[PDB]
From a paper:
Additionally, we have previously shown that the Paracoccidioides americana (Pb03) homolog of Cbp1 is capable of fully restoring lytic capability when expressed in a Hc cbp1 mutant background, suggesting that Hc is not the only species that could be using Cbp1 to elicit host cell death. Mass spectrometric analysis of Pb03 Cbp1 revealed two signal sequence cleavage sites, which likely explain the doublet on SDS-PAGE. Crystals of Hc H88 and Pb03 Cbp1 homologs formed after a week and diffracted to 1.6 Å. To resolve the phases, a heavy atom derivative was prepared by soaking the Pb03 crystals in K2PtCl4. The structure of Pb03 was truncated at C-terminal residues 65–67 from chain A and 67–68 from chain B, as the remaining amino acids were not resolved in the refined density. The asymmetric unit for the Pb03 Cbp1 crystal contained a single dimer, whereas the asymmetric unit for the H88 crystal contained a dimer of dimers. An alignment of the Pb03 and the Hc CBP1 dimers gave an RMSD of 1.6 Å, indicating the structures of the distinct homologs are conserved. Interestingly, only the Pb03 (and not H88) structure shows partially negative N-terminal helices. Using a N-terminal FLAG-tagged Pb03 Cbp1 homolog that retains its lytic capability during infection, we confirmed the cytosolic localization of Pb03 Cbp1 via this subcellular fractionation approach.
The most abundant virulence factor secreted by Hc yeast cells is Calcium Binding Protein 1 (Cbp1), which is absolutely required for macrophage lysis. The mature secreted form of Cbp1 is 78 amino acids in length, has no known domains, and, prior to this work, had only one known homolog in the closely related fungus Paracoccidioides. For both Pb03 and H88 Cbp1, the three disulfide bonds present in each monomer orient the alpha helices so that the aromatic residues (Phe12, Phe19, Trp30) are packed in the interior of the protein, creating the hydrophobic core.
Residue numbers in the entry:
A (entry chain B): 1 to 65, 69 to 77
B (entry chain A): 3 to 65, 69 to 77
The structure:
């Protein structure tokens, strides 16, 4: 099973990179988005606590979530 | 669409990671207790008692830890 775990971690790192590039290109404002989403999930609260600077937490937040200020963050 | 595409791929990665770590008998709660002081993602994952697979995945990606055999 260990090859599968390692493979999935590799795919996660690739997705995080792709997500960072795509949201940056769309001018996502993480702090305004996360202020709106923080009460909605544990991931969003954690992402706001890191000021939006932790892309894996930003990604988990968006995947978990009509929020104002989230244009370009999807 | 590029952001939405990445989000779709993320959901597939989370499913596979859950299946793979379960097949590898990952002991999430003990692993996260060992890692919780190491990163914001790990402290958040422990706060959800390991039940939040996206937070578990972010923790493992960000992090000699006891109990983490099969989680990485």
């Amino acid at each position: 099973a260990q090859p599968a775990v390692k493979h999935a971690l590799g795919q996660f790192n690739q997705v995080v990179t792709m997500f960072e590039k795509a949201t940056a290109a769309a001018s996502c404002n993480w702090i305004t988005c996360l202020e709106s989403l923080a009460a909605s999930s544990a991931a969003c609260a954690a992402a706001l606590g890191e000021l939006g600077l932790d892309i894996p937490l930003d990604l988990a937040c968006i995947a978990s979530a009509s929020a104002q200020g989230c244009e370009g963050c999807f």
